mmCIF file of C-alpha atoms and ligand atoms in Angstrom:
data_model
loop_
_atom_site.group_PDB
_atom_site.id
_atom_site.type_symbol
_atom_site.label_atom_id
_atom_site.label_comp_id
_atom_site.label_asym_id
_atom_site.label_seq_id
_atom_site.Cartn_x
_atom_site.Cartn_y
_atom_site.Cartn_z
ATOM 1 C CA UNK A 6 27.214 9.313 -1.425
ATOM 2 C CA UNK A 7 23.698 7.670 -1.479
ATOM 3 C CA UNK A 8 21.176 6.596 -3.862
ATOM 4 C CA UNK A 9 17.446 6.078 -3.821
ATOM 5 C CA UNK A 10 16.160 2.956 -4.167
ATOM 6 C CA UNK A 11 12.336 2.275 -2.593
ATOM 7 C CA UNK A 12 10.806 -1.519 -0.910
ATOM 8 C CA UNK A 13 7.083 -2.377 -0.962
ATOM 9 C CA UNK A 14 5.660 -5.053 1.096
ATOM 10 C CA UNK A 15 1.745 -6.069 0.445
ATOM 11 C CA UNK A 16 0.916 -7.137 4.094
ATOM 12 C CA UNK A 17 -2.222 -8.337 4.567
ATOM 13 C CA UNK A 18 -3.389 -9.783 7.875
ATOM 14 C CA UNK A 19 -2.503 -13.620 7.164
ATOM 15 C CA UNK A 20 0.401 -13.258 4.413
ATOM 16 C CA UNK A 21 2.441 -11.355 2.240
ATOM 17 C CA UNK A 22 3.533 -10.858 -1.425
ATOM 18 C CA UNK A 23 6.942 -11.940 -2.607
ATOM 19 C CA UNK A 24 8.488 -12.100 -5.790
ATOM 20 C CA UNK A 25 11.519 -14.322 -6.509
ATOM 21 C CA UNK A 26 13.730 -12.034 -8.939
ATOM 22 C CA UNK A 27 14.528 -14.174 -11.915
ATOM 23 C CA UNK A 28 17.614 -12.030 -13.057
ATOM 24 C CA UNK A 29 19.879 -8.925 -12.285
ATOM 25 C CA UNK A 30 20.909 -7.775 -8.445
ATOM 26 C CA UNK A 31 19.060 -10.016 -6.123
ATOM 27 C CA UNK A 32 18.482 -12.362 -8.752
ATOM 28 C CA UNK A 33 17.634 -16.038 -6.674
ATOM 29 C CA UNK A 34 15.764 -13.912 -3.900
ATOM 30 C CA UNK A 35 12.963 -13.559 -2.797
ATOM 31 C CA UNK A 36 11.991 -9.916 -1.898
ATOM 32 C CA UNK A 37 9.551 -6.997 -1.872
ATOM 33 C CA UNK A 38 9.448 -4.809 -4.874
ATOM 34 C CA UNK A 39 10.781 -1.619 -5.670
ATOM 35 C CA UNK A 40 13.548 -0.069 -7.755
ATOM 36 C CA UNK A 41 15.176 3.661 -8.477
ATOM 37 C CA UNK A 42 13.831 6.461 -7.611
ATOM 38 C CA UNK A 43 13.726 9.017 -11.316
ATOM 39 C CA UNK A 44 14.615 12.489 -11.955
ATOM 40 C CA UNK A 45 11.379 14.447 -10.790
ATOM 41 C CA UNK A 46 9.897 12.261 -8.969
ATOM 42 C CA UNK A 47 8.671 11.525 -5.466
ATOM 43 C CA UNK A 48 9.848 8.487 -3.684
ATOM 44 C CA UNK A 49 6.330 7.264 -2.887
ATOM 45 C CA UNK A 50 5.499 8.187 -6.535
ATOM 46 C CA UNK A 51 8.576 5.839 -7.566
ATOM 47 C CA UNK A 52 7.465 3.272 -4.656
ATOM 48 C CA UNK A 53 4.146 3.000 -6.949
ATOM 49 C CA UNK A 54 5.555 2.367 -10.139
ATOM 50 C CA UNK A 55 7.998 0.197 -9.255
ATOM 51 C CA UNK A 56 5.202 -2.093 -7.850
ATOM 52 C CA UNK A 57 3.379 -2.192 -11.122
ATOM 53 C CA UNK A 58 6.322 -2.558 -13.097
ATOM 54 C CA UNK A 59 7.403 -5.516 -10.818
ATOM 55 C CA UNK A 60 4.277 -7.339 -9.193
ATOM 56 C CA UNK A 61 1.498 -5.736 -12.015
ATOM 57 C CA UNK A 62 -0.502 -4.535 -9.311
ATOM 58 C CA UNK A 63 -2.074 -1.320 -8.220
ATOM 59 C CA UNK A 64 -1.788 0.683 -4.838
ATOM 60 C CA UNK A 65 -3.409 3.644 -4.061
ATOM 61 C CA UNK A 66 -2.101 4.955 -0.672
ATOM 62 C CA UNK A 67 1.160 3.457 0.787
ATOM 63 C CA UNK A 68 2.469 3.927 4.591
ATOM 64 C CA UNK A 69 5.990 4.261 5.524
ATOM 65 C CA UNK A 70 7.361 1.529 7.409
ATOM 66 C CA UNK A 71 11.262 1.879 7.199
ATOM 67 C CA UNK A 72 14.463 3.355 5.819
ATOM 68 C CA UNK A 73 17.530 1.139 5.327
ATOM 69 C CA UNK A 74 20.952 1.927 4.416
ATOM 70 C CA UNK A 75 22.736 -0.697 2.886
ATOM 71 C CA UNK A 76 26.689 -0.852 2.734
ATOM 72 C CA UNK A 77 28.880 -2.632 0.396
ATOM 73 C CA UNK A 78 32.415 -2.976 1.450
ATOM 74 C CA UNK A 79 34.266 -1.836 -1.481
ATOM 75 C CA UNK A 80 31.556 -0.033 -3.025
ATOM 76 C CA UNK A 81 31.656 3.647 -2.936
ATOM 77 C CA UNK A 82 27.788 4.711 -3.694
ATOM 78 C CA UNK A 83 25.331 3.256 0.070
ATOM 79 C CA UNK A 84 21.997 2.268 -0.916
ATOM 80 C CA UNK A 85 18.856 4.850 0.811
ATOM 81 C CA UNK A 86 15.603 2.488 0.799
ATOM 82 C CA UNK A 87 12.948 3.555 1.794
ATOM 83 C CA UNK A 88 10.457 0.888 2.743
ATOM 84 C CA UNK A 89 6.906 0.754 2.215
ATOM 85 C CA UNK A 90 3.546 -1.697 3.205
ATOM 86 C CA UNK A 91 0.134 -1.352 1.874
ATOM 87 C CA UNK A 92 -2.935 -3.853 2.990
ATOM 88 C CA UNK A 93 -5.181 -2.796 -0.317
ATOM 89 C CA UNK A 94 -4.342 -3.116 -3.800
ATOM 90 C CA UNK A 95 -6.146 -3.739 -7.165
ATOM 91 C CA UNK A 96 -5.133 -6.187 -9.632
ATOM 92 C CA UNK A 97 -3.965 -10.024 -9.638
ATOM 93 C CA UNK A 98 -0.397 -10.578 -9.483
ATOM 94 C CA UNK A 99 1.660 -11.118 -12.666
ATOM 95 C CA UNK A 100 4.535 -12.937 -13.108
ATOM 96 C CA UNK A 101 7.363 -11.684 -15.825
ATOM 97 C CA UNK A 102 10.796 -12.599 -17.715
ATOM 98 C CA UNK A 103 11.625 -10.522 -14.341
ATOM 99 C CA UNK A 104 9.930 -11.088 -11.528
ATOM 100 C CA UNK A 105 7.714 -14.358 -9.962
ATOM 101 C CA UNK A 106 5.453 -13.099 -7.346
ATOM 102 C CA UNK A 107 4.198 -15.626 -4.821
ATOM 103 C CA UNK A 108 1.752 -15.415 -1.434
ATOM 104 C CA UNK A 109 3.283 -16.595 1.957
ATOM 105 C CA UNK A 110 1.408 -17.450 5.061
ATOM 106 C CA UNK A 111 3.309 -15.301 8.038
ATOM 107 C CA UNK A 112 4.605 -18.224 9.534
ATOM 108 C CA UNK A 113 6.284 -19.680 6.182
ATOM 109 C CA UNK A 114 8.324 -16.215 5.622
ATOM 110 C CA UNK A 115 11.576 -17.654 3.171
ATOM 111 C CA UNK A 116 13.942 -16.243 5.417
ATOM 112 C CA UNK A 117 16.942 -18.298 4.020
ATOM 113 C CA UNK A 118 15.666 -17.481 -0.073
ATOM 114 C CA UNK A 119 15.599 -13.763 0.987
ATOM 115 C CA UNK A 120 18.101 -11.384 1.466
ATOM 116 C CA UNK A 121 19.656 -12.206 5.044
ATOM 117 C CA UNK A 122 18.989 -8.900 6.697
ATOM 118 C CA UNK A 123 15.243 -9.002 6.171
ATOM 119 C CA UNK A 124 15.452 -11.807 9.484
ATOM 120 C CA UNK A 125 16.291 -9.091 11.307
ATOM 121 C CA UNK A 126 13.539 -6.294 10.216
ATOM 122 C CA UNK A 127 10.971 -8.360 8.598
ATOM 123 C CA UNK A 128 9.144 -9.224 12.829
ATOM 124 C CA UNK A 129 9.019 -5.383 12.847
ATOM 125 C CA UNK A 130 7.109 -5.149 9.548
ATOM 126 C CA UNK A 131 4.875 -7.866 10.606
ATOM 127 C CA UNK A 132 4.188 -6.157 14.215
ATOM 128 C CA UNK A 133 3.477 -3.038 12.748
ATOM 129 C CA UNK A 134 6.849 -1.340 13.838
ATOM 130 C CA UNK A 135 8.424 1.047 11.866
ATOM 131 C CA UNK A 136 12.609 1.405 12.170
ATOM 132 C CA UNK A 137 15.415 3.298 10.710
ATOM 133 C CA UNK A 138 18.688 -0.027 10.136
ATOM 134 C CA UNK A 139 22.173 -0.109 8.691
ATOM 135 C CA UNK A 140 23.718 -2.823 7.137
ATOM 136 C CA UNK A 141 26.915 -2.965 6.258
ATOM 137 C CA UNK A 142 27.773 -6.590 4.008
ATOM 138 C CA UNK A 143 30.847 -8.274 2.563
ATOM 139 C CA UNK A 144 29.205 -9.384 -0.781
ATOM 140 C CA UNK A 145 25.953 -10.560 -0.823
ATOM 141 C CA UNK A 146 25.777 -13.524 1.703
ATOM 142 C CA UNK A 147 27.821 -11.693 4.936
ATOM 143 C CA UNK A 148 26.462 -9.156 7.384
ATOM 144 C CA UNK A 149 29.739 -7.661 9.088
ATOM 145 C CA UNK A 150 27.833 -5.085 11.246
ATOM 146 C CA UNK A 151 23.843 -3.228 11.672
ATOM 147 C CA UNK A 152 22.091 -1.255 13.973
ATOM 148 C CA UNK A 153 18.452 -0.967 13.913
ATOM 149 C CA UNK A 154 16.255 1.210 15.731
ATOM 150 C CA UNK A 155 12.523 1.140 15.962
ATOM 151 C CA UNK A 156 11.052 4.927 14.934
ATOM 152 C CA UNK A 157 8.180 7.193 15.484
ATOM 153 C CA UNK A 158 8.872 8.770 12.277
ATOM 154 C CA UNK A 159 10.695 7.393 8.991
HETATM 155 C C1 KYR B 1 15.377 -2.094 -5.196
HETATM 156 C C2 KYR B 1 15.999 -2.914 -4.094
HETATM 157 C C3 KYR B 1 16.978 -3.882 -4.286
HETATM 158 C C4 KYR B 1 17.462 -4.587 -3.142
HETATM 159 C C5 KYR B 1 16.928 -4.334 -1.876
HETATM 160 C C6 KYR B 1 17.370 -5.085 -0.694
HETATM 161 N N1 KYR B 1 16.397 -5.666 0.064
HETATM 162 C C7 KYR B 1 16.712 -6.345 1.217
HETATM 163 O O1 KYR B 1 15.718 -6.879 1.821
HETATM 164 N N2 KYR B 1 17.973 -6.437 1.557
HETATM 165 C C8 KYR B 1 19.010 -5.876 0.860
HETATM 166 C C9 KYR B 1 20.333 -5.980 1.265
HETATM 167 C C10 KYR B 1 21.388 -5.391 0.628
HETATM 168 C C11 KYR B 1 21.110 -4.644 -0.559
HETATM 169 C C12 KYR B 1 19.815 -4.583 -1.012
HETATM 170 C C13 KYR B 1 18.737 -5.198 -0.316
HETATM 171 C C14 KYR B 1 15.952 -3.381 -1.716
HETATM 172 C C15 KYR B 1 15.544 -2.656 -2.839
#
């Protein structure tokens, strides 16, 4: 009982895109952008849209970096994200009624305005590591239990 959901981070070498999500789940957060995966689709095809829809800029080629199940105690249907980075993109950020996107030098990261498992997996993104994590949380502000495992393969 899992969904797809997909996570792009645009790392370059000296900082990284947020965007602070202005309503809806993860509203207040700062995060990577991404969304559902559709009927028909490929989950790096849906990685790409979801970055336009959200940020308003282009990728071309995105790598794999991750896959994260997330847990809900409570809730019957586990989140499947699959994470993504790209260095190159086309475009200038756009901020929305949704979304405000925002640069971050790699030593300013807004670990306690993000979700609170990114801590945890965000110094593998920024090493280059890729990992395979569970997270099981009681609401939205409580870890209860992870593992996480750096890969070879997502
Ligand atoms: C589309 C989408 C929405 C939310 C997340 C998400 N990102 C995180 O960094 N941590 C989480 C923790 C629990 C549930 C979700 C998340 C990813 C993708």
């Amino acid at each position: 009982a899992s969904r797809l959901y997909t996570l792009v981070l645009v790392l370059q070498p000296q900082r990284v895109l947020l965007g602070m999500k202005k309503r809806g789940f993860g509203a207040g957060r700062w995060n990577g952008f991404g969304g559902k995966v559709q009927e028909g689709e490929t989950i790096e095809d849906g990685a790409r849209r979801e970055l336009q829809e959200e940020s308003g800029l282009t990728v071309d080629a995105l790598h794999k970096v991750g896959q994260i199940v997330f847990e809900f105690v409570g809730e019957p249907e586990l989140m499947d994200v699959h994470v993504f980075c790209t260095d190159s993109i086309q475009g200038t950020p756009v901020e929305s009624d949704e979304m405000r996107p925002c640069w971050f030098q790699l030593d300013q990261i807004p670990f306690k305005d993000m979700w609170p498992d990114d801590s945890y997996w965000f110094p593998l993104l920024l090493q280059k590591k890729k990992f395979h994590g569970y997270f099981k949380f009681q609401g939205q502000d409580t870890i209860l239990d992870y593992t996480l495992r750096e890969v070879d393969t997502v």
